[PDB]
Curated annotation (Swiss-Prot):
Interleukin-16 stimulates a migratory response in CD4+ lymphocytes, monocytes, and eosinophils. Primes CD4+ T-cells for IL-2 and IL-15 responsiveness. Also induces T-lymphocyte expression of interleukin 2 receptor. Ligand for CD4. Isoform 3 is involved in cell cycle progression in T-cells. Appears to be involved in transcriptional regulation of SKP2 and is probably part of a transcriptional repression complex on the core promoter of the SKP2 gene. May act as a scaffold for GABPB1 (the DNA-binding subunit the GABP transcription factor complex) and HDAC3 thus maintaining transcriptional repression and blocking cell cycle progression in resting T-cells. Residues 11-107 are annotated as: Interaction with PPP1R12A, PPP1R12B and PPP1R12C. Homotetramer. According to PubMed:9699630, the formation of a homotetrameric protein complex is not required for the chemo-attractant function. Isoform 3 interacts (via PDZ 3 domain) with PPP1R12A, PPP1R12B and PPP1R12C. Isoform 1 interacts with PPP1R12B. Isoform 3 interacts with GRIN2A. Isoform 3 interacts with GABPB1. Isoform 3 interacts (via PDZ 3 domain) with HDAC3. Isoform 1 interacts with GRIN2D, KCNJ10, KCNJ15 and CACNA1C. (Microbial infection) Isoform 3 interacts with HTLV-1 tax. It comes from the Eukaryota. This is Pro-interleukin-16.
Amino acid sequence: GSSGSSGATLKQLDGIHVTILHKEEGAGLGFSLAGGADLENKVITVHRVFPNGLASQEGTIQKGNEVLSINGKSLKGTTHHDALAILRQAREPRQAVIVTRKLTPEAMPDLNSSGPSSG
């Protein structure tokens, strides 16, 4: 393994964006977990993102997204329930930490094109 080394000519290290949700104790995140170990999707994903919630509000946790961890708890192969529950526990607090990557729905578009430069 390894971790960093020295100041490189980069900024946006990796395509991970932490989402800090600010809610009340037992207010709910606004989204649900999907997938499991016993399922076809080992990695749990965002099942759905309620229309009236925090997750949606942020816009970070979008259905289909990849849920690496929740509340700092990484999925070591948790089932569907063990996950759902764990998710129901991450909602107990007022804040929740979910690590997800920027994924696309279908046929990822080209977020770039021959253009000008800046600096």
